[PDB]
Design a protein that fits this description.
Chain A has about 400 residues and is mainly alpha-helical. Chain A is built from 18 helices and six strands. Chain A has a domain of about 110 residues: Potassium Channel Kv1.1, Chain A (2-Layer Sandwich), CATH 3.30.710.10. Chain A is flat. Chains in contact: A-B, A-C, A-D, B-C, B-D, C-D. Bound molecules: cholesterol hemisuccinate (4 copies), the ligand CC[C@H]1NC(=O)N(c2ccc(Oc3cccc4c3C3(CC3)CO4)nc2)C1=O (4 copies), potassium ion (K) (6 copies) and zinc ion (4 copies). Chains A, B, C, D: Belongs to the potassium channel family. C (Shaw) (TC 1.A.1.2) subfamily. Kv3.1/KCNC1 sub-subfamily.
Amino acid sequence: SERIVINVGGTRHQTHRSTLRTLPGTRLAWLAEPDAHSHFDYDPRADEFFFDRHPGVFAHILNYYRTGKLHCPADVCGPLYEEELAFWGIDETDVEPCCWMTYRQHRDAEEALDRRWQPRIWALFEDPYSSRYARYVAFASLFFILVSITTFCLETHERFNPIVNKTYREAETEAFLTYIEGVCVVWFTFEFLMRVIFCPNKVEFIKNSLNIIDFVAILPFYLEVGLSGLSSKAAKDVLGFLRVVRFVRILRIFKLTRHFVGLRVLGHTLRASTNEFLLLIIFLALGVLIFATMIYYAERIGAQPNDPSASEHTHFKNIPIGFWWAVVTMTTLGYGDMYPQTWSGMLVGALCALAGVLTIAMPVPVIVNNFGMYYSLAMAKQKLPKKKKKHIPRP
Amino acid sequence: SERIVINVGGTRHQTHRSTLRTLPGTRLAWLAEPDAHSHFDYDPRADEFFFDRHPGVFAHILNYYRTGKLHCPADVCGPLYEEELAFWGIDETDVEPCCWMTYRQHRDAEEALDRRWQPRIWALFEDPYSSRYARYVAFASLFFILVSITTFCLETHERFNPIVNKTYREAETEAFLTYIEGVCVVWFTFEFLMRVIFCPNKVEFIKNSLNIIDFVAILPFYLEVGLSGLSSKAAKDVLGFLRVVRFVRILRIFKLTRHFVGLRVLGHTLRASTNEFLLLIIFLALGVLIFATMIYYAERIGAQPNDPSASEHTHFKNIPIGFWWAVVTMTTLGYGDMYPQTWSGMLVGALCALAGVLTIAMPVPVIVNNFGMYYSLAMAKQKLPKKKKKHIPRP
Amino acid sequence: SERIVINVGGTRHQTHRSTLRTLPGTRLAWLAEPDAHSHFDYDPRADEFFFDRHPGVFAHILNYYRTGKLHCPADVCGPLYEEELAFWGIDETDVEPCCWMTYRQHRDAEEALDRRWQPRIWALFEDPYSSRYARYVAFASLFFILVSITTFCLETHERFNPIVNKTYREAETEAFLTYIEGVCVVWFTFEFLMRVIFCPNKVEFIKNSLNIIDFVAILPFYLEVGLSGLSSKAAKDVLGFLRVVRFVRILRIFKLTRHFVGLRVLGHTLRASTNEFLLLIIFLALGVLIFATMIYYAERIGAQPNDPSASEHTHFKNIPIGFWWAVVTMTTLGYGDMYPQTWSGMLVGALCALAGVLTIAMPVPVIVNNFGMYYSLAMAKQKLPKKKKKHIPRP
Amino acid sequence: SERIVINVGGTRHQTHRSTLRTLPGTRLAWLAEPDAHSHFDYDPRADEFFFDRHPGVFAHILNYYRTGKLHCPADVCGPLYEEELAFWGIDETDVEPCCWMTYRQHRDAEEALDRRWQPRIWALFEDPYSSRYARYVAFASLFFILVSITTFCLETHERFNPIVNKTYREAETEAFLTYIEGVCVVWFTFEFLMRVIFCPNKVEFIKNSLNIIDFVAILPFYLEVGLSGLSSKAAKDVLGFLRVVRFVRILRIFKLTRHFVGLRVLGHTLRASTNEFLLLIIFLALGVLIFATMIYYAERIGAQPNDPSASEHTHFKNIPIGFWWAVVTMTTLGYGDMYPQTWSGMLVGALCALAGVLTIAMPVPVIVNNFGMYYSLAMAKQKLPKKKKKHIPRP
Ligand SMILES: CC(C)CCC[C@@H](C)[C@H]1CC[C@H]2[C@@H]3CC=C4C[C@@H](OC(=O)CCC(=O)O)CC[C@]4(C)[C@H]3CC[C@]12C
Ligand SMILES: CC(C)CCC[C@@H](C)[C@H]1CC[C@H]2[C@@H]3CC=C4C[C@@H](OC(=O)CCC(=O)O)CC[C@]4(C)[C@H]3CC[C@]12C
Ligand SMILES: CC(C)CCC[C@@H](C)[C@H]1CC[C@H]2[C@@H]3CC=C4C[C@@H](OC(=O)CCC(=O)O)CC[C@]4(C)[C@H]3CC[C@]12C
Ligand SMILES: CC(C)CCC[C@@H](C)[C@H]1CC[C@H]2[C@@H]3CC=C4C[C@@H](OC(=O)CCC(=O)O)CC[C@]4(C)[C@H]3CC[C@]12C
Ligand SMILES: CC[C@H]1NC(=O)N(c2ccc(Oc3cccc4c3C3(CC3)CO4)nc2)C1=O
Ligand SMILES: CC[C@H]1NC(=O)N(c2ccc(Oc3cccc4c3C3(CC3)CO4)nc2)C1=O
Ligand SMILES: CC[C@H]1NC(=O)N(c2ccc(Oc3cccc4c3C3(CC3)CO4)nc2)C1=O
Ligand SMILES: CC[C@H]1NC(=O)N(c2ccc(Oc3cccc4c3C3(CC3)CO4)nc2)C1=O
Ligand SMILES: [K+]
Ligand SMILES: [K+]
Ligand SMILES: [K+]
Ligand SMILES: [K+]
Ligand SMILES: [K+]
Ligand SMILES: [K+]
Ligand SMILES: [Zn+2]
Ligand SMILES: [Zn+2]
Ligand SMILES: [Zn+2]
Ligand SMILES: [Zn+2]
């Protein structure tokens, strides 16, 4: 008589058949049919149906059935409630906004985070420490990347570019640094040559950004060597262009840091928080423009309409330079190259400081907390090494 | 015999009729009446009343009945407990302070966040991307707003105001920038004219701050054009005033950013955190005044009562300038235009730095966390698109 | 037979009499006695004892009885668990460290936050807005405090102290500012005189820090007026001392801000977080000393043992000045008056920057979070105005 | 018939014997054996097994049995769930990543935080305040450490090193400071001598870093005294070396601060967050290198290939100095000694500022939150003094 008792894991839940039918197409709606006594596990003597599930969360699922809103309990995790909803046939997109984010947190974080000697030669990058030879190769690669970066940094130092007035007063970098860069080049191009020759999935290897970086890093030395024969003025200009391009040597440390879990988590966080990064950029641009205009106008209060001497006493000659001042003041960087010198400009700068603090504190915590989730999940996955399931599902 | 059993969703709750009557005027108080056996769903054989509700939270409601204090469970959400309290007749303002904020969080966040061709022409701003023509119009508006802002920023640059000594050594802005601003004006005033002519709810349209901004942005060009005919000295002064007013061009980017969810969430957060903003302002003012006075006095320790040379060795000539120093030091901005040069002033500046850090870290986290709630709720509402209810309430 | 059933709010809990006796002196230990059948509410037919309490938390209390450790459920609040423990006779100091802080949070926050016309005249400060006359008096007091502060700030400005060379080239402040300070004095001393004459609890009134501040603020004007008659050189020195003491005028704004809930919450937070403030001070001192010594030594690498020219190229002449540099660099203030100019000093300064960031981020979040608790509780108490209890305890 | 009822603390849990056998080797798997009726507490009349445990968490353990995933309820603490899992034979390493971190938090924090007169003389450092004589000794040690640090700081001040041109224009520190350092030395070496003579566990005492620091602090004075007799030029060089080593006096304040709970918690946090510190270091190095290169190239846009005058207008002569600029800009320190002066360098500096803010805000919150856990746990352990257990385990 409209009375149905559901025994979920030893706990008897009593509700109405109309309440069960309120959500058609689900297991509890099917149970509310006159044929459930034969279509389900039914007890004639006890006059109740049995279910080997978790009653505590069945209570909340039946609360959805009863009221019309699907919430999520805070005493169990999202994955557990998801398994129970899947078993009961409840659509997980019915979760109310008051619980959706907490319910999805873990799944969202997981989504964000996720010849016979030819294989041996291709194993040079895969777990280099696994083999002694590959570990030694990795150590040599670290040496020859650090040395290349050091040579690139030193080539710009004035000590290594004494001015030669014989050939014409121009500068000339020392040749020993070039020789060290050359030995770096020969070793690193040996590695690149073996990687390119012994290369499965050629399309993927070419598309690989790290390999592209390696190729564009090795190109300039060869191009400079070849073009030196031409020894033309246009060849000199192209040599200058090649020197400009030589900066790609610093990008070979991303290969070294590619195995770092913190770096991978940071990359995943950057991919996930694109909206927050765009929000930060837009906020910063708005504040920069507004405060540059405000300081420009506050530093000219009481000035003549067109007198050129109005701008002779203020660092803020124009609004574009106020942009730089505003970004520096908003980031609390405060270089001091430009600062207000009037009372009105002083008030404007104070407002700029507080506004920058607040507008940067708006989305940076969101990005930081996303990074926290992803880092914690990665560390947990490390601390939980793969092992036997220990559980046998039913035949 | 004073013993009453309430069967809430299959779970039997046993309490005393005096306990039920402790809260008069509620459903459980009515149940505690001699006529509940006919006024409610009663089972003579089982001698208990049945309720198709959530027992887990009925336990806490009955705990309110039993002890006298209404708390809120942490295993269910505020909206769920609110529905249950509403059904049971419990006043939601009885929630104790230890649980009120958590119970209300979601509702507070939601409150904070909340001719035949004439409609087609009025659809120019409503979902411009919806129609191809309106999307093109929006692209053109973006172009003509960015170009206007660029021209306004460039007019203040010294490169575009060569000094003319013929007519009288004064500055004169280039005319090509004025011409580009003029084409910007003609397009934007075409848009404004159509918006004003085809305008439902004229009162609302006039009261609209964005439309007011548009009108005050278009006024100065027309006023300068008209007043140039007068060519009087007072007309020149009014032209200078119009140049000052010309700054309202930068306010036309708020129209572009008005569709941004981050901007709307920021606005809602600013509306909600007025108390925290006032607290921040008052704290900053107190600290600024106190530390300006303290540094003024610390830089004059051991000085003569009236010797004018006492202030010749310190940046802190007066307390008003100490205000600027104190705000700069409190925000950790540290421009460096003024800094203590004595030991006592050094100690005072250190105290200013720490005090500013703490007093700014007091309410900024509150504002940030409010922003976090509102942003998370808005993102959840986006991720949860409107769909079928999927639930049928009882006839 | 060692089997006892406890019916707590309709839920039957079955345990052993030895388990109940494991904690002597409590209600459940008494229940485990052969005389509980007459000393408690017992049901012979059902063979169980009845209790009109919350079973969900009785389960955790019985878990304490069973295992030996008292924990606190996260599905209910600390006050609720406290009431239940008090009823069951459990000592609340048995709570394990894994739950003690969460259990106590709310109570700790509450502890931190906590003639016939003679009363009318004494009501001048109590809710001044309550009476129209008192509100007008408060407005006048605000006016005469702001004006006094403005006069005090302006007296130090060079515009108001033109140098008089007739009487002897010394400075002399303008007399109109003194006259305005005098009218401020007469009004404020009228208020102070009425407060002192009509004064209940004279001991408390004298001990009041705000009234002490008022008296020390009014003293210097009278002392300067009286001592001007002496017109002696020692009198001039005492006049200079009185000018130094005149700074106490800025302390009369604490009276205005004493009614501010944010200010009161800040005071409570300062009282509560004394340990964290001491930790911050000690950390800062350690880092300052260490980094001052480190930078002093890093700026003298390769220098002569005693050559005086070693310190001619570095801002770090000594360690005491390195203290100032270190505090400025640790607070991320970066004035720029002193900075490393060597590679070793540069590394030391970088280490100082990161170390300061971390050591300041250590306890500042603790203080901030305490402030957050207290502010949230105060706002909740405001949002929950006093009303009828609505609940009637049993006779 | 495949139906088994488990009565856990008065609550009847009904499941299948196959469900119980899904996890072999556990208590519930043993219960699912035909001999459980004699191997466990069984009730023939009621046909159920009894367990004096917590049903609420038994429900989640049986949910593990049922589904195959072990989660952890959020309504109870990690230690409680750990005791229950241990009783039921469940491996605590089966906890899913969605709950592992919350389940382990407390245990991880605890792991991170963890003659007859000869003993009396050795009690000089153990609870010095316990005995009056030891408290006086501690006060004297504080005096003689602070005075030594003050003398060390003052010896580098130019006031105490007047230049002597008689003996040869070199500097000479005052002798009274040396005499005060000598009395400091005699007292502190008395303490060290008694500590070394009366010393249990000599190996541990020698290995103690604080005692090593004490010995290396006392060595230089004796070495300078002894070597002064030689009075050789090489002896003068070794005297300069000893002056350099004299810096170890500042390390004697770690002994004073070794009893501070905040310092111990900081040390534990540093030990625990090694991964986060390495992440911070690697992030900072990557950003510093990248932004130094970027600013170097942005300040030379449009410059000649080799013209020496290209670097005459920019602070960024090389990339190594850009390293210093980049670290200063990333930490928001902003000294101002070097800043971009071009538009491209300005954009690069802005990007550096935001990138530094974000990359420093990534792991610093993790370290801060670890510190928060450890500090809260230490304060809780203090607030919970050792007392009687009050609970008697079963014979
Ligand atoms: C420091 C910088 C970031 C500027 C300061 C930020 C806020 C103080 C302002 C700047 C832009 C403002 C927004 C600009 C325009 C709009 C659209 C406005 O909606 C409309 O105008 C639609 C029509 C109407 O009903 O008026 C709602 C507020 C909002 C989001 C504003 C909220 C407040 C904002 C974020
Ligand atoms: C850096 C700036 C913000 C100043 C430093 C802030 C705090 C160290 C001080 C400044 C003002 C102080 C408040 C000024 C006056 C009062 C009113 C006082 O109450 C009374 O005086 C009422 C009568 C009495 O019982 O004395 C309680 C403390 C409180 C809030 C003080 C708490 C401590 C405060 C916040
Ligand atoms: C930037 C400033 C704050 C200095 C850097 C802080 C930490 C890197 C150091 C400085 C002082 C150190 C503490 C100084 C001395 C001790 C006592 C030491 O215990 C003993 O020496 C007792 C006897 C023994 O077993 O050795 C335990 C570590 C601890 C707290 C140290 C932990 C690491 C600390 C906090
Ligand atoms: C301001 C500094 C810290 C530089 C900016 C940081 C991020 C914008 C960049 C710098 C280094 C990047 C990482 C460098 C290389 C890799 C390895 C890459 O994996 C591979 O290349 C493996 C082969 C392939 O499938 O391509 C995955 C992304 C990741 C972690 C990158 C993610 C994005 C990172 C963190
Ligand atoms: C060339 C004329 C020269 N003489 C003169 O008083 N002014 C002036 C006047 C008011 C004024 O308001 C201010 C003040 C601060 C910020 C600010 C404004 C704006 C222009 C209205 C918008 O942003 N600014 C400048 C001048 O610019
Ligand atoms: C013109 C006389 C001149 N000669 C002289 O010693 N002083 C002096 C003395 C003490 C002194 O205390 C200090 C120090 C630091 C901060 C501070 C104070 C106040 C005045 C009491 C309040 O805020 N300040 C200054 C002077 O101002
Ligand atoms: C007067 C002699 C002069 N010539 C010379 O090389 N030095 C020197 C040598 C090493 C040195 O180590 C450094 C470097 C950086 C920081 C630092 C140290 C300490 C002294 C060991 C402790 O803190 N410092 C200075 C000098 O001070
Ligand atoms: C000596 C030649 C001189 N003349 C000239 O235009 N350039 C130049 C050109 C482009 C350029 O791109 C930039 C700009 C900003 C950052 C940046 C780059 C890199 C080199 C490509 C990598 O990091 N930088 C510099 C010069 O360095
Ligand atoms: K800063
Ligand atoms: K700064
Ligand atoms: K700075
Ligand atoms: K900061
Ligand atoms: K500076
Ligand atoms: K600076
Ligand atoms: Zn919900
Ligand atoms: Zn509560
Ligand atoms: Zn616990
Ligand atoms: Zn889980």
